[PDB]
Amino acid sequence: LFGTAGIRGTLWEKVTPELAMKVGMAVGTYKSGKALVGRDGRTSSVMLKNAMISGLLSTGMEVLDADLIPTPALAWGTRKLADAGVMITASHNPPTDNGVKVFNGDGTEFYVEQERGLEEIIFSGNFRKARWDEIKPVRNVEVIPDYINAVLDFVGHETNLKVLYDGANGAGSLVAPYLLREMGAKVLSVNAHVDGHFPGRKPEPRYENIAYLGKLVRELGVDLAIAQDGDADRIAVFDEKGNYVDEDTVIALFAKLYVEEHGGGTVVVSIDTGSRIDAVVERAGGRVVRIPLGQPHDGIKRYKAIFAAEPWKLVHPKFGPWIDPFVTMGLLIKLIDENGPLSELVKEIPTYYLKKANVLCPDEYKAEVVRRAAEEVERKLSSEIKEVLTISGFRIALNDGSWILIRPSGTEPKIRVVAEAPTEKRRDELFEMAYSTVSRIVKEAEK
Amino acid sequence: LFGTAGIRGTLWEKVTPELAMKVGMAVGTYKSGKALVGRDGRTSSVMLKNAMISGLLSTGMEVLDADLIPTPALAWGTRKLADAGVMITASHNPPTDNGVKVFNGDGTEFYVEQERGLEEIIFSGNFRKARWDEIKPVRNVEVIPDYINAVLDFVGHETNLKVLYDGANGAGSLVAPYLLREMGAKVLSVNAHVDGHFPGRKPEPRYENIAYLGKLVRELGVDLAIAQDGDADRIAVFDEKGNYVDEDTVIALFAKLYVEEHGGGTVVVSIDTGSRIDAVVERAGGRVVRIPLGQPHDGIKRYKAIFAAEPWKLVHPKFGPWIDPFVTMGLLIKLIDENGPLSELVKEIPTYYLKKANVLCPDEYKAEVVRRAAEEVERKLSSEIKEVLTISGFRIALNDGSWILIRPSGTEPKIRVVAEAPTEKRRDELFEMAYSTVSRIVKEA
Amino acid sequence: LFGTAGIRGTLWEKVTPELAMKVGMAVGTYKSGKALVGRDGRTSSVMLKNAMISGLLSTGMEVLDADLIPTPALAWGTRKLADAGVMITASHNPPTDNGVKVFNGDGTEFYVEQERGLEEIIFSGNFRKARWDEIKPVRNVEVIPDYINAVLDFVGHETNLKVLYDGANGAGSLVAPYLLREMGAKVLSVNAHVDGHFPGRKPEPRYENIAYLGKLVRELGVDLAIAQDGDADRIAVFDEKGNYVDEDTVIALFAKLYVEEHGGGTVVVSIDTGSRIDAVVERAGGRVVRIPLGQPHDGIKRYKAIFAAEPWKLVHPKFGPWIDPFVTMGLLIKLIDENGPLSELVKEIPTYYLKKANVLCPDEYKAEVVRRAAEEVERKLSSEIKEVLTISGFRIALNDGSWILIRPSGTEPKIRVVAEAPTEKRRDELFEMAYSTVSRIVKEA
Amino acid sequence: LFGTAGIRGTLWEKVTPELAMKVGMAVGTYKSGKALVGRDGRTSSVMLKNAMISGLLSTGMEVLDADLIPTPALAWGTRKLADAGVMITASHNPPTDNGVKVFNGDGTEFYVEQERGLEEIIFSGNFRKARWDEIKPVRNVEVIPDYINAVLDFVGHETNLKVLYDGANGAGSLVAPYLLREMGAKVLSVNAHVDGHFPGRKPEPRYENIAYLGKLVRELGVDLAIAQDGDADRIAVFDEKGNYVDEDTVIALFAKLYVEEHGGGTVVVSIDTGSRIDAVVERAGGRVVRIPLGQPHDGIKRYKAIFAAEPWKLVHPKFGPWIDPFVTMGLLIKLIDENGPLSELVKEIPTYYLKKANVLCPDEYKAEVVRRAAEEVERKLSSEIKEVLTISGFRIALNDGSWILIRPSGTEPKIRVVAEAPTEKRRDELFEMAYSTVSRIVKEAE
């Protein structure tokens, strides 16, 4: 059931009312006391929330119903109010899809160990049943105003910046515009009316889904563009010139800020974030530990990290251990007002050049093909190896700051192939090697 | 799954979230358009309503959420607003129980065809599945105030009577006090805070549960007492003396007034309602048909009748097809204001005397036992037999207005034994005979 | 505008939407930050709450709207949530009336200088005005469940008692029956549906408005009857024998309880409470001080008291400064469960005999009549005299524990007369002296 | 208290909680039965709505609380649900201001006679007071989804057009995006999160507040842009090329559509809508009658009109006697899908050239300066006069389709001066004559 980022899938195939009721029933067998429930704007979300609540109620848990809320606010509100938290969302997936994310009473997403717990209870049907006289009444709660205040107290900044905010027709529309305006920003919102058909654009704030914003920034005269996904756990940014600031740069900006403050410390990033981060962290005298994509919070506990991130998701541990783009965009505005325009701050981040691509493989082979292709690429680059990470596929780092990721995704039946180098010519050289080496090996096992 | 009146049963045994959702899914596979959804105050109802609503939504039906409402208001609202109605309730059962009642867009409970249809669909697992872009938002609706206005306009009576209302800690507490006050009634309410532990009393307004009201009537100086079940589709009444006005006298009163205004016409009642009703209806020039316990309005269509009833449950078809105790309490008060105290109006209703007991019998041998027992009673009394009905067990009617009913039960494993006579002796004789005939057959096989 | 415990009067006469708006304006000129807003169930209370809320918002205060909650829950919620509280209510006044009560961030009612401060601002019309961009959104808050949990945690007692709860169709109906149920009590409720017409009875839980409850306690076999007013700040109790436990007996029971645990300590009662409190407190080695009818907490601050009370209104300082009958309720159940049936417990209380009546008197002839009709009775009986109190009219205490009270009413044009003595004779002779001493000096002018 | 379109003003100066409570007390003295109450997103709207409901309750009226709703949804819901309608809004004014609009049970705005009735009642203090036992409980109602269903039913059109919707941070944002999506439109919204600070732009959809939209239309490849005000009773449009379609062109598309349908009929437009209406109405065999600003509904009963409009505000009598930009945007999409791109459709509208400015005049003179100036411009144009309307200021129509408006606004120390002509030279020449004539006569009385 759980992938890397919760339970996610297409309606009727994987995600059903029946399952959502099973997950509530399992959350109230594994955990007890109070459950904070929230949902995103998808057409199926109220249907799945009513199932979830039916499930949670059946176990004797007191349900606190927050209804339509961004995921971060559900994580924050869970810490403040509840013993467990449940979010109805498929985040960045199309409107055919929904899912469930589960949170603990400290605001952290479920650990791998806790997910397997919940699945064992679902597979067994061994659910805690309340007596009739232990079934607690639902309590409606209003979290967004408290969340917005907690984010303004944390950020401690006033602005006059003009800001373009793109809400993907999602839960961020009920929080980001108001937060920015409270800070004294002049907000021009796009896709900031909540709509589960995602009429504005595909909700995932990939560059190709939000490219129009770069043009909007120049015409409008804004200091900064901010885009989100449907449950607003992601953040994407454009500068005052309408340049897309890519995800590694956004992370590098904060990785530098955090390490320089502390005069050092551990930063934790995903296996698939690049050398912009190692570059600015080492120069300022801290270190980088890489972990699998999915659990940026996990790294904080293990490595005592001051900052953790994956592409589009930063964690601000002094605020709390959830991905918090509301903190992120608040602090990005403080960075600009305190140091000058965003395009000049991105110049102080070194250029690397990434090139990724999927290369299709059956799920039966997947793992064999990666293991055999990592060995071959290592051998061909043996003169240049700095380190091989094995924690999530194979990340091969080279002496000059280049690296290759060869990794199977947990879901789709294919292999992820990333290469990054300090030059375009070498981005191309290494990507070709990695791509074609995987391509050729795939078609071997396929005959 | 469906008995006489909805799906009922105990939490976790037969009634679950899983089933509540499958029923929603079934209703939205069998019908389309709008579902009006309501619940009573049991501790499990919001949980089941959540599951139900998930069900309904998954089929592309547009849910209207009326939340905590009495069943008659759900029936009325279903006719105003929706193509189907669903009610989370077990009406008069203990706090441990809940269930679902399903209504059509004209306000009638499911007919047997439609119950079976729904049962097949659940068994099949073949539920209609909306596409993501056909799942409809929930609409919250406030029914009670419009329901109250509709009763008030139908009854068209102001009053100054003092009324004692017992809402059985249930859904009636949100409606009857306010309808009585709007009519002019001075209401003293008991058990009129909503609570699914039913702390005040067992919710079923059987005399044995509501008999304290008798003495309360005396002290408080009230004209009338009204008592209800947890979803408020039952009504029981006490008079100004504090005397219980049993369920046939109540039906008799309504039978009498309906057959008079008309100048005759048909009155459908249950197979277990006795001769108080036959007496007033023939005297005022009308006829009585009988059906099985379940939906009095089945009768109305079938026997073009002007009134129908079972014990506690009266239908006023000029208003609508559903059991409507809110109409009943409004017309009882109108009756009294126009004609004089209730105790006076009940003297003008012939006495008969009823004794009833249940004899346990396995759900398996029920048809078998009755069969023999009834033909034995037919033989032992053959000189007197005026009529035998086989529609629900056997109702053996004698020449001297007496009768014996020997009926198999539905949701319990017992046979139901009843006698009505015009004397305490002729009663005691026909019952302590009829009971021991069934009793002795059950002690063989 | 303010009397002893709030602004109150007749709709359209003294209390208007206009006044309700000016008070909101005045509160948010005198204070800043957050205002918690609550109301009782009177017909006019939503109209005045809207006017009140418009007032507060206009000053830049952040309004927290609790809607329909009892006064104690508003005072409790104010301490938890806000810088000021506002209650729309006239507590025990008839349905023709409403009012406002203003609370501080610690949950105390308006102190006199706040009252005067507020009145000058209203007369002046110089109200703080928010700029457009400082008017704050209303926040809806659910207080009752949290207030219920706070009271349970403080009473620390589960029971199995049967209890008769009479909510005067008022705000207590949404709270008492559920607090009693979560403890384990089997609640039988009367007048426990909210109704601003107060159909059940006069909302003031005077013996003669709630008399009927006595013969009802016997009938149902309850261990205790509890009655409140419409805002539920008041409590009145009958025992399992259906004997009215008069209001000093209740006070004395808690007096005894609070002083015995402590080993002495001081007890603030109002000037018109009797010798029952004097006796159980001295006996237990504690000290009794009298203050005027108003706010019993003024006593806790001044005299570091462990317990304050007036007739029908107890304060439990360990919980909070407000009159809290939800705490009284629960500690009284815990008393009975720990020391036996209530009728027994009221026997361990000394008996005195009380009589009172009102003499109509113009406002300008109150200051005059009393002082000069008290000079007189002070001289006649200056043999016995143990102490005269003049802090609130004249209260003449004798050496045999007897006493007389002549007092000018706050909010009505009449002189109040009270006599109490250890004996049936000594009582009836004092009341008849003092009552006709006034009546006579009235017809001088 | 009432100006053109309801009671409007700056917070604390004219518009107060105490005023809003008086207006409620007045409406429940002038009218009986049920009152539907709505508001816009202004920071003061909840404060004034609470005061309004307090007033209305005090008179025994049954209050139906629709909360935050656009004005057109309030007029339609009033017709469905109630005997009176109240809207808390200052519509297009800055966030410093608020206001009250009142509506009859048939969904018409209050007539001048009805406004005086209310003002007298407010000025006398003689409000109907309910007895305690007649104060009715407030009923919360959900109008928007019923309203969207009625507009979709009335429009009878499915689409796949791309559409830029600009909600000006206002009540339109809760209806227009959903009504467009349900028609099949691919909606990209700007300023479609409600906020009383109007952070996106000034909510009045004059061209100069919404100029940026024309630029976004091109970049984004949209077929149509639609911009509204704060209460969404106004509509403004840009075509697929980012061309601002001016308010007379929008009215004219619809005058022509309505007059071609009926082969004739009367169209009622305000005194300051110009000649492109006359061109398409006469060419299809209909006639144009003019009335003053603010009363476009008054045309329907008075002149039996099939369509009525003033700049930004169109009435579709067959749906209701209120300004309904939701019906408008729906019918524009239907127009475009059935006839071709918007830019092509506006080419079939004859070109006139307008030029407007104000001239400062003390309130004490105003009337005198306009009367004298109009007599003087008439005489100078005497060889050319088609018609001179006096119903609101002086509108001087010439034989060639040109015209001059000289009008004192009934709320400000200035005189409004319009001139339109088939040609640029004639525009300039006629505007030069009228502007300078008025400008001179002002300073003599000084």
Side-chain angles (χ1 to χ4, degrees), chain C residues 27-326:
Chain C
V27 164
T29 307
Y30 188 90
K31 299 256 221 177
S32 78
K34 305 188 201 178
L36 184 62
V37 179
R39 68 167 184 108
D40 72 5
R42 287 156 189 278
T43 62
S44 49
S45 299
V46 170
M47 177 185 71
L48 301 174
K49 187 197 67 167
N50 279 244
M52 176 61 60
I53 288 182
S54 199
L56 296 164
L57 288 169
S58 83
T59 72
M61 288 203 86
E62 189 175 357
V63 169
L64 310 182
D65 189 350
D67 199 41
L68 188 24
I69 74 162
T71 300
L74 182 99
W76 177 87
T78 295
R79 195 180 63 187
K80 291 321 195 200
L81 293 176
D83 298 291
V86 182
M87 182 61 174
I88 310 306
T89 197
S91 192
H92 72 302
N93 281 30
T96 51
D97 293 14
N98 219 319
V100 182
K101 285 181 158 142
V102 178
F103 296 81
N104 297 304
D106 59 4
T108 49
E109 284 213 51
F110 40 54
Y111 61 104
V112 74
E113 293 105 327
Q114 197 180 179
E115 298 182 354
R116 280 201 223 92
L118 285 174
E119 291 171 333
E120 263 100 283
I121 301 154
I122 290 164
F123 200 79
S124 66
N126 248 243
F127 297 123
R128 173 153 53 208
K129 305 295 181 191
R131 320 159 55 197
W132 73 271
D133 55 352
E134 306 165 334
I135 303 173
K136 288 163 197 88
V138 179
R139 302 191 68 184
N140 296 335
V141 293
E142 201 193 28
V143 178
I144 290 167
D146 297 304
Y147 167 72
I148 292 189
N149 290 331
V151 171
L152 291 171
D153 293 351
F154 185 85
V155 170
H157 189 62
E158 314 181 304
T159 179
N160 297 294
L161 286 178
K162 226 194 166 196
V163 184
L164 179 61
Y165 179 79
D166 188 321
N169 298 126
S173 311
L174 300 177
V175 175
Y178 310 103
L179 167 74
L180 294 180
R181 200 255 284 148
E182 253 260 273
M183 278 177 99
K186 288 80 171 211
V187 179
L188 194 150
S189 53
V190 275
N191 314 316
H193 75 277
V194 177
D195 193 331
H197 294 242
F198 292 117
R201 58 161 170 101
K202 288 181 172 142
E204 177 179 12
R206 271 205 209 156
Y207 167 72
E208 81 194 75
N209 306 317
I210 61 172
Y212 62 83
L213 282 179
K215 203 185 158 205
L216 246 131
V217 164
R218 294 188 271 278
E219 226 321 311
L220 310 157
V222 311
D223 300 294
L224 174 61
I226 291 166
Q228 299 201 267
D229 53 1
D231 58 339
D233 82 341
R234 288 188 211 229
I235 183 164
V237 359
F238 296 68
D239 61 28
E240 75 283 13
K241 279 221 153 66
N243 301 312
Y244 187 56
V245 184
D246 69 35
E247 38 268 337
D248 297 352
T249 308
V250 164
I251 297 166
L253 246 35
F254 277 92
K256 188 158 130 185
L257 197 259
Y258 265 105
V259 176
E260 275 168 17
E261 161 185 347
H262 210 76
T266 283
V267 162
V268 179
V269 283
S270 86
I271 202 164
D272 61 350
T273 65
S275 309
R276 292 178 204 252
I277 296 131
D278 285 297
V280 292
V281 173
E282 278 149 19
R283 172 140 293 211
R287 165 197 310 260
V288 171
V289 180
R290 282 185 166 65
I291 65 161
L293 255 20
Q295 200 209 239
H297 192 253
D298 295 336
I300 277 95
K301 294 169 61 179
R302 178 140 268 129
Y303 306 97
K304 307 287 134 129
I306 47 159
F307 173 59
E310 330 176 332
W312 295 284
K313 296 177 217 185
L314 289 65
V315 187
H316 306 273
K318 282 166 55 167
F319 190 54
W322 51 81
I323 302 158
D324 200 314
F326 295 103

Side-chain angles (χ1 to χ4, degrees), chain B residues 138-140 142 145-146, chain D residues 138-140 142 145-146:
Chain B
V138 180
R139 285 219 276 186
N140 292 329
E142 193 201 25
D146 293 312
Chain D
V138 169
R139 295 248 252 160
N140 297 333
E142 189 199 20
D146 293 321

Side-chain angles (χ1 to χ4, degrees), chain A residues 11-12 17-18 21 25 43-44 46-47 50-51 53-54 57-58 95-96 129-133 135 138 196-197, chain B residues 11-12 17-18 21 25 43-44 46-48 50-51 53-54 57-58 95-96 129-133 135 138 196-197:
Chain A
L11 203 69
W12 308 134
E18 287 91 342
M21 187 170 55
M25 276 171 91
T43 63
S44 52
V46 165
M47 181 185 67
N50 291 17
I53 289 170
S54 194
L57 288 183
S58 90
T96 62
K129 295 290 173 65
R131 307 154 49 81
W132 70 268
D133 64 347
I135 296 170
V138 170
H197 295 59
Chain B
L11 212 66
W12 312 131
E18 291 91 342
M21 175 168 59
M25 284 179 176
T43 63
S44 58
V46 166
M47 175 185 76
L48 294 185
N50 273 248
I53 281 177
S54 204
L57 287 176
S58 86
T96 49
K129 255 47 178 151
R131 311 164 56 208
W132 68 270
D133 58 344
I135 300 165
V138 180
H197 301 223

Side-chain angles (χ1 to χ4, degrees), chain B residues 217-423:
Chain B
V217 172
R218 284 199 274 287
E219 291 170 36
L220 299 178
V222 289
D223 294 288
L224 174 51
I226 300 152
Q228 287 208 269
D229 48 1
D231 64 319
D233 75 341
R234 285 173 207 257
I235 183 161
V237 359
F238 294 72
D239 74 1
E240 65 260 55
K241 252 70 218 205
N243 295 319
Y244 188 49
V245 185
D246 62 20
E247 25 285 327
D248 294 357
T249 319
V250 175
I251 306 158
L253 253 11
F254 278 104
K256 189 182 185 172
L257 301 155
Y258 266 122
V259 168
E260 291 177 349
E261 191 238 335
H262 203 75
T266 304
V267 163
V268 170
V269 288
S270 55
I271 210 145
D272 53 347
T273 60
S275 293
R276 295 207 210 235
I277 300 142
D278 299 307
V280 301
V281 171
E282 284 148 32
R283 192 205 302 147
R287 30 173 270 121
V288 176
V289 177
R290 279 180 170 61
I291 49 186
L293 258 7
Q295 192 180 347
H297 188 268
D298 289 327
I300 268 86
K301 272 173 76 218
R302 165 161 274 125
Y303 300 119
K304 313 302 171 162
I306 50 159
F307 172 56
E310 355 189 302
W312 295 282
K313 288 143 150 277
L314 278 67
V315 175
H316 309 266
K318 271 167 129 235
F319 188 55
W322 53 80
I323 299 163
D324 204 319
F326 298 98
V327 163
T328 300
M329 67 185 85
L331 293 174
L332 226 199
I333 286 169
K334 188 190 196 178
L335 185 65
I336 291 161
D337 275 342
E338 266 167 359
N339 299 302
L342 179 60
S343 72
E344 302 286 292
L345 307 179
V346 294
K347 283 189 228 170
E348 295 188 292
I349 308 288
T351 293
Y352 296 83
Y353 310 89
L354 185 134
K355 197 168 173 203
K356 60 194 164 219
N358 316 317
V359 218
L360 278 184
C361 191
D363 273 328
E364 313 184 33
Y365 302 134
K366 281 200 294 214
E368 164 188 338
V369 167
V370 169
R371 199 187 64 234
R372 263 131 70 188
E375 291 172 24
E376 193 202 273
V377 166
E378 268 205 70
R379 265 146 38 192
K380 279 190 179 186
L381 303 177
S382 301
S383 47
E384 332 177 25
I385 288 181
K386 183 179 173 187
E387 178 173 75
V388 163
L389 308 163
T390 77
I391 299 180
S392 184
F394 296 91
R395 192 195 155 76
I396 293 141
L398 310 182
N399 282 319
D400 75 331
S402 286
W403 50 270
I404 314 186
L405 174 63
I406 304 151
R407 154 175 172 264
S409 198
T411 32
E412 306 214 62
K414 13 213 215 185
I415 291 173
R416 260 145 206 174
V417 201
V418 184
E420 225 204 27
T423 82

Side-chain angles (χ1 to χ4, degrees), chain B residues 208-219:
Chain B
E208 49 256 36
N209 293 325
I210 66 172
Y212 65 89
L213 286 187
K215 205 169 125 208
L216 253 107
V217 172
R218 284 199 274 287
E219 291 170 36

